[PDB]
């Protein structure tokens, strides 16, 4: 029970940290997915077989990291170490 998280504090990191082993893991976890999403957009224009696109609705001009960080919170990604 808190106030609505604004800007870069959303998604709330505490709930982000419940779905991961440590702070460090979450970084590569998210970033490597941020790489996939940006590949998809650049590849799709000329390439098939791209990584699966955004599993959630992309906000207007939303940063690829900001997309990934949200669907992690949506438990829509699988975690391997």
């Amino acid at each position: 029970g808190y106030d609505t998280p604004l800007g870069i504090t959303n998604p709330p990191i505490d709930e982000l940290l419940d779905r991961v082993s440590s702070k460090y893991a979450l970084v590569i976890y998210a970033a490597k997915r941020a790489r996939q999403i940006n590949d998809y957009y650049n590849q799709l224009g000329e390439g098939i077989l791209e990584y699966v696109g955004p599993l959630v609705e992309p906000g207007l001009q939303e940063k690829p990291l900001s997309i990934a960080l949200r669907e992690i919170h949506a438990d829509l990604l699988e975690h391997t170490e």
């Binding site: 870069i8 504090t9 970084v27 590569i28 998210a30 970033a31």
Partner: peptide, 17 residues
């Protein structure tokens, strides 16, 4: 710049954490 760096910034180095 890199996708990992910003991830490190927002998560590890963010002042609110």
């Amino acid at each position: 710049l890199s996708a990992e760096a910003q991830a490190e910034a927002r998560i590890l180095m963010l002042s609110s954490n």
